[PDB]
């Protein structure tokens, strides 16, 4: 059927176009899964690490990336395209403060990211950066937020978030999870953020195999959890 537009970025007879939607299955060669959860006044990123070597280090592995002092992110997809995406995110976050004189909202930043990913679809002759980005941040008079940017130039903000390999299995768990009206008191958030990834991947991970980024109304600085207190939340859910 296909044929017609499976090399370059032009239209297919009546349908769409294939080179952009081949980047959606370009995330899955990472072999990884990330989960973001917004329940109440805090916000939690959780993502496992996969260290296949003892000669390989520990500090230079983390996918949690601090964009500004109040905005952190996590990256999926292939590795080299992910870091160049972060370099644009760190750059244009500082241009907002210079041009406009105040801290950039987390909502405004995904507009500036997806529009750069838009030109690479509209205008040809550059590979469109097969990686995905998830943001968290605290907004005044709006609470915490979770955003996702796509390689096509799409973005949408939403409460419970999965990415990587296992979206359709983790989001299926979180639809049944976020339907009851339970409150989310900063450990209801984390324990659901663990046990969703822990059952979909089926790992119920040992303490040294993940990362957890957090932000909370109290201390709006982006914060990467210590390995000791990761064990404290792990012994909390399994009493």
């Amino acid at each position: 059927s296909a044929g017609f537009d499976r090399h370059i970025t032009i239209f297919s007879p009546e349908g769409r176009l294939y080179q952009v939607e081949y980047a959606f299955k370009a995330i899955n060669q990472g072999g990884l899964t990330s989960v973001a959860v917004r329940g109440k006044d805090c916000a939690v990123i959780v993502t496992q690490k996969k260290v296949p070597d003892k000669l390989l280090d520990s500090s230079t592995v983390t996918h949690l990336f601090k964009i500004t002092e109040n905005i952190g992110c996590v990256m999926t997809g292939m590795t080299a395209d992910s870091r160049s995406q972060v370099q644009r995110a760190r750059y244009e976050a500082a241009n907002w403060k210079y041009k406009y004189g105040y801290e950039i909202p987390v909502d405004m930043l995904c507009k500036r990211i997806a529009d750069i990913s838009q030109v690479y679809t509209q205008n040809a002759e550059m590979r469109p950066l097969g990686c995905c980005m998830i943001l968290i941040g605290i907004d005044e008079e709006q609470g915490p937020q979770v955003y996702k940017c796509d390689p096509a130039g799409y973005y949408c903000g939403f409460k419970a978030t999965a990415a990587g390999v296992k979206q359709t299995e983790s989001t299926s768990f979180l639809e049944k999870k976020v339907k009851k009206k339970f409150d989310w008191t900063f450990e209801q958030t984390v324990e659901t953020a663990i046990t969703c990834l822990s059952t979909v991947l089926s790992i119920d991970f040992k303490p040294s195999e993940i990362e957890v980024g957090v932000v909370t109304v109290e201390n709006p600085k982006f914060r990467i959890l210590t390995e000791a207190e990761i064990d404290a939340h792990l012994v909390a859910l399994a009493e």
Partner: protein, 152 residues
Amino acid sequence: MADGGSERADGRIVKMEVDYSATVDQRLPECAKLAKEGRLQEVIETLLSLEKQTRTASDMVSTSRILVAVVKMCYEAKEWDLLNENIMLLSKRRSQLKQAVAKMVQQCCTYVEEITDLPIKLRLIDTLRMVTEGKIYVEIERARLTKTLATI
């Protein structure tokens, strides 16, 4: 490796009455930290079944009396915590908890002609909680059935 936990269990069965049984539950988390290790061959399932045998034997002596609540609250203690104890992602379902309670439902077969109907169905309603999860697969698949027939 875990023979030190066996000779400490040799101490606690003498000190069920000489010392108080909460101290048996105070020597217990060291044997849990031994089960927290559980690496390859040293302190793993075969020797873990011995502490699981001796902690149930101490649970037999402590709750042979009408103070029954200790054997039950020790179970929802450890059987919710075994996901954090031994091996994560469904441990083994292999001789880490099975015969420790397959002995106990055999004890519920013994006490049903001795103990009255009230604390034994409190005993059954607290063992139905983890029998619904696992431990009735094969071998003693009737760990549920020899006690749900008792409920009839």
